[PDB]
Design a binder for this molecule. Structure first.
Ligand SMILES: CCCC[C@@H](F)CCCC[C@H](C)Cc1cc(O)cc(O)c1
Ligand SMILES: CCCC[C@@H](F)CCCC[C@H](C)Cc1cc(O)cc(O)c1
Ligand SMILES: [Ca+2]
Ligand SMILES: [Ca+2]
Ligand SMILES: [Ca+2]
Ligand SMILES: [Ca+2]
Ligand SMILES: [Ca+2]
Ligand SMILES: [Ca+2]
Ligand SMILES: [Ca+2]
Ligand SMILES: [Ca+2]
Ligand SMILES: [Ca+2]
Ligand SMILES: [Ca+2]
Ligand SMILES: [Ca+2]
Ligand SMILES: [Ca+2]
Ligand SMILES: [Cl-]
Ligand SMILES: [Cl-]
Ligand SMILES: [Cl-]
Ligand SMILES: [Cl-]
Ligand SMILES: [Cl-]
Ligand SMILES: [Cl-]
Ligand SMILES: [Cl-]
Ligand SMILES: [Mg+2]
Ligand SMILES: [Mg+2]
Ligand SMILES: [Mg+2]
Ligand SMILES: [Mg+2]
Length: 653
């Protein structure tokens, strides 16, 4: 019976949210929701007003730590939720700019009896909080997809005698003119109920009801509207049987790849399941080795009862170095506070040689790693603390500046001893999205900044620019460069060629290398070792085109390979949703080929690795059945390509 559903839903959500979220965070959320004109959820948070300790050195009070613990803050890009992990009862999933594919509930996790509320914000963009109007993206929004179920099962589904209020999504900014709510089954499986908060979405069967999601501030919807997408009960038909398929019932992601000197191919990333070994808790890191004929030699899974991923991997020719973040305590390590970075070493046989966890009392992220020809290892990332030196934004003065990241690069020897750590940036956000060593002892770093780091930012409202830093063998800066348009420009990865020149790839919403074809476009930029910009190429379709994550590699012939996603017809006719794409360039920026592949469902490449004089590997993630039938939610895939023309080969030979 749906009698008194409004009172039952309000009391249940209020009870759970106010029990789980720290008072500091409730105070922050209530203030933001009131300011933004999305007040519906505020009355669900009944904790007392509490000082928000933006700069506390206590890891348990430091607000960046608290906010990160209960949130997935995504990027200015059109994002899949590449950071989702089943590590908390309540999670705020914030898509920001771009057309985001938002998921928070892993259908493959053991969540029986667990309270689970995912609070979704599809856009809710930074510009709302600008005191001065007129910003390029003020008032702009995108079509976000809120994933509340798939072909396999409804999400947040307790399937018991109650109204199923213990698990539910709450979407705070659903716009039926633009956004989509994805649901299991068909429209006859649901019933919409107008409530004080907005709309309740109930799964309905003979035995009763189960609350799937609440839409704050929207009423009078219809299950016949095109803003609901129903996925039925049957896994997608398989395409691309030539690909290697990696998947469990949980969310599985490849985020990176590399090759050793014998031509063995490695992939790795994060999984909510038991992929390389028995799941330790929430998301774990994992990696796998394949011989050059496509046979898997081993898979390994490691981490903690908290959340970690492999975000980068590189080889010294024999060993495999891996890097990422963790929210827990790794084996043979101590926590520094909040989330930390780590670097680990695996030998060719899959033995974990060591793992080094490093960081500060506050939030570190690390997405990148490189290995030089001497066998030294460099990680890179960003920190809210004072890792390589004092953070540019240390404490609150008379003028409040929101806590913010600086970039860092850390150098290690082959035994994991830290040789140095360099930290740099501006008073505002500076994130790292790239690290690459040359042959002469130097190392480059690259990323995004809201500030004026290597040049005056021309954005009127702190839109991102790209930055590049060259460090010497001792970690001292030789130069800082910055490039961009007045709009957002976002870098994903960098790499050097055999001459020591540095290349970066990203997306732009403006005219960076040329006239923007529409929406996001791809760019590739080249700088010389002395900091001079040589060229920027920009290309795309009228739709959304971008590299993603480990988006560049450079082979021994100085061919450049790029990869990412597109929802246009970039390398061919789009198969549906986003597809993966890859491209090859020469060292002068001439485009040699451009290919597109994927399923009718959401796909993106996440990594590209070229074998010298051998195959090209493009790997990524999918909601479709790529290689074989999807086992649950996100699965992963690797494609073996002819590097001369981008044509897909059978993975196994
Ligand atoms: C469910 C509630 C949503 C809360 C969070 F999910 C996101 C809101 C972030 C607040 C705002 C962006 C920060 C801020 C402060 C400032 O002082 C200057 C700024 O430009 C920007
Ligand atoms: C793995 C993806 C993580 C992406 C993060 F990079 C998101 C940044 C948070 C946004 C924030 C509201 C903007 C902002 C910062 C700032 O330092 C000053 C501001 O006024 C405003
Ligand atoms: Ca986004
Ligand atoms: Ca969005
Ligand atoms: Ca939206
Ligand atoms: Ca439920
Ligand atoms: Ca884990
Ligand atoms: Ca830390
Ligand atoms: Ca900074
Ligand atoms: Ca810019
Ligand atoms: Ca485009
Ligand atoms: Ca790369
Ligand atoms: Ca697709
Ligand atoms: Ca899966
Ligand atoms: Cl971002
Ligand atoms: Cl806005
Ligand atoms: Cl109930
Ligand atoms: Cl209806
Ligand atoms: Cl099939
Ligand atoms: Cl082996
Ligand atoms: Cl600045
Ligand atoms: Mg029920
Ligand atoms: Mg097989
Ligand atoms: Mg390489
Ligand atoms: Mg296959």
């Amino acid at each position: 019976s749906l009698l008194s559903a409004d009172e039952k839903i309000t009391e249940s959500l209020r009870s759970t949210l106010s029990d789980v979220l720290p008072d500091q965070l409730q105070t922050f959320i209530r203030t933001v929701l009131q300011f933004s004109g999305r007040p519906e959820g505020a009355n669900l948070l009944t904790g007392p007003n509490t000082e928000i300790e933006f700069f506390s050195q206590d890891p348990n009070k430091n607000f960046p730590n608290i906010f990160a613990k209960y949130s997935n803050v995504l990027t200015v890009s059109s994002d899949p939720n590449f950071i989702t992990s089943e590590d908390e009862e309540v999670k705020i999933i914030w898509g920001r700019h771009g057309s985001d594919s938002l998921i928070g509930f892993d259908p493959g996790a053991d969540l029986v009896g667990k309270r689970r509320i995912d609070i979704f914000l599809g856009d809710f963009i930074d510009e709302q909080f600008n005191p001065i109007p007129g910003a390029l993206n003020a008032g702009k929004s995108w079509s976000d997809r809120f994933i509340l179920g798939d072909w396999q099962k409804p999400y947040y589904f307790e399937d018991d005698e109650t109204l199923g209020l213990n698990q539910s999504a709450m979407i705070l900014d659903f716009n039926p003119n633009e956004d989509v709510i994805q649901l299991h089954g068909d429209r006859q499986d649901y019933e919409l109920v107008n409530i004080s908060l907005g709309t309740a979405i109930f799964w309905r069967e003979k035995k009763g009801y189960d609350l799937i999601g609440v839409l704050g501030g929207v009423s009078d919807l219809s299950l016949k509207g095109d803003y609901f997408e129903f996925k039925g009960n049957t896994a997608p038909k398989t395409v691309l049987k030539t690909a290697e398929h990696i998947g469990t019932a949980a969310n599985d992601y490849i985020f990176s790849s590399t090759v050793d000197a014998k031509g063995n191919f490695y992939v790795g990333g994060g999984t909510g399941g038991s992929l390389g070994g028995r799941n330790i808790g929430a998301r774990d890191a994992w990696l796998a080795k394949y011989d050059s004929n496509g046979n898997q030699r081993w898979s390994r899974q490691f981490g903690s009862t908290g959340t970690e991923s492999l975000w980068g991997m590189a080889s010294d020719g024999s060993n495999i170095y891996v890097a990422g973040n963790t929210t827990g305590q790794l084996e043979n390590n101590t926590v520094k506070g909040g989330n930390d970075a780590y670097l680990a070493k695996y030998d060719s046989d899959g033995n974990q040689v060591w793992i080094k966890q490093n960081g500060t009392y506050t939030l570190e992220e690390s997405y990148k790693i490189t290995v030089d020809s001497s066998g030294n290892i460099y990680t890179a990332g960003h920190t809210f603390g004072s890792l390589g030196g004092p953070n540019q934004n240390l404490e609150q003065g008379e003028v409040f500046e929101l806590p913010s990241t600086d970039g860092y690069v850390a150098k290690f020897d082959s035994n994991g001893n830290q040789l140095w750590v360099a930290q740099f940036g501006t008073i505002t956000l500076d994130d790292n999205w790239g690290v690459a060593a040359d042959n002469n002892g130097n190392v480059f770093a690259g990323g995004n900044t809201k500030g004026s780091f290597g040049a005056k930012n021309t954005g009127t409202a702190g839109e991102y620019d790209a930055w590049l830093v060259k460090l010497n063998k001792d970690g001292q800066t030789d130069w800082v460069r910055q490039f961009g348009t007045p709009n957002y420009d976002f870098m994903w990865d960098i790499e050097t060629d055999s001459l020591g020149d540095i290349y970066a790839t990203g997306w732009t919403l403006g005219d960076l290398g040329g006239k923007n074809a529409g929406s996001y476009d791809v760019w590739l930029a080249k700088y010389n070792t002395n900091g001079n910009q040589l060229w920027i190429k920009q290309f795309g379709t009228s739709e959304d085109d971008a590299p993603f994550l480990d988006g560049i590699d450079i082979d021994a012939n100085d061919n450049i390979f790029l990869t990412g996603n597109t929802n246009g017809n970039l390398g061919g006719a789009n198969a549906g949703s986003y597809d993966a794409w890859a491209a090859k360039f020469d060292k002068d920026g001439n485009q040699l080929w451009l290919k597109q592949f994927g399923t009718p469902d959401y796909d993106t490449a996440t990594t590209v690795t070229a074998v010298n004089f051998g195959k090209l590997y493009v790997s990524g993630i999918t909601e479709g059945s790529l290689g074989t039938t999807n086992a649950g939610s996100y699965d992963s895939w690797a494609l073996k390509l002819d590097a001369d023309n981008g044509e897909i080969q059978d993975f196994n030979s």
